[PDB]
Amino acid sequence: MDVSKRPREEFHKEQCLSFVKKLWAADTLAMFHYPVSATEVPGYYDVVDTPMDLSTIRKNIEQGKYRTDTEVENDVVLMLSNALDFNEKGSQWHDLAKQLKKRYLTLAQESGLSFDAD
Numbered sequence: 001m002d003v004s005k006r007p008r009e010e011f012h013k014e015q016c017l018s019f020v021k022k023l024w025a026a027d028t029l030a031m032f033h034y035p036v037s038a039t040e041v042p043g044y045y046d047v048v049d050t051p052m053d054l055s056t057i058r059k060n061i062e063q064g065k066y067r068t069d070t071e072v073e074n075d076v077v078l079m080l081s082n083a084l085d086f087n088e089k090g091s092q093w094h095d096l097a098k099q100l101k102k103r104y105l106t107l108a109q110e111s112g113l114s115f116d117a118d
Contacts, residue, residue, distance in 0.1 A: 010068040012113065016061045019111040023076065023104065024054055029096055032079060047086045052079040070116045076104055 027033060032054050036044045045051070052075050060066055060075070083097035108115065 011064075011066055012069055013061060013064070015112045016066070016069060016072050017058065019072070019108050019113050020054055020058050020061065022107040022111060023100065026100060026103065026107065027054070027096070029092060031083065031093055031096060032100075044086065048082045050078060050082070052076075052082065054079070068116070069113055072113075073104075073108065073115045077101075080104070 024033065034055050035051060035053050036048075038044055057072065057075050057079070061072065066072055080097050080101045083093060084101070087094035087097065
């Protein structure tokens with residue numbers, strides 16, 4: 001495991017929440033804010049096996065269930081991936097997911113976060 005080789009803090013609660021607040025605001029359609037309601041997006045869970053949204057991420061942060069900052073990146077990436085998969089290219093939904101996939105690393109930087117490439 002080499003736990004001694006880890007930094008003293010692998011999880012920065014405040015920065016992760018700041019990161020999510022930026023994602024929340026960058027979400028121009030409010031599409032990522034809550035778990036999808038099937039009645040508002042019919043068939044959604046017929047495609048998406050592993051749903052993820054910003055409120056769930058925010059909850060996992062607040063309750064300290066994340067072990068590392070990089071787990072937070074992983075769920076953001078999952079979230080955006082679901083949108084890119086479910087939605088058709090050229091749709092406002094797909095376009096946004098694309099923008100956020102291109103931009104989130106900068107948002108993380110600006111929130112003082114640094115993920116692990118490994």
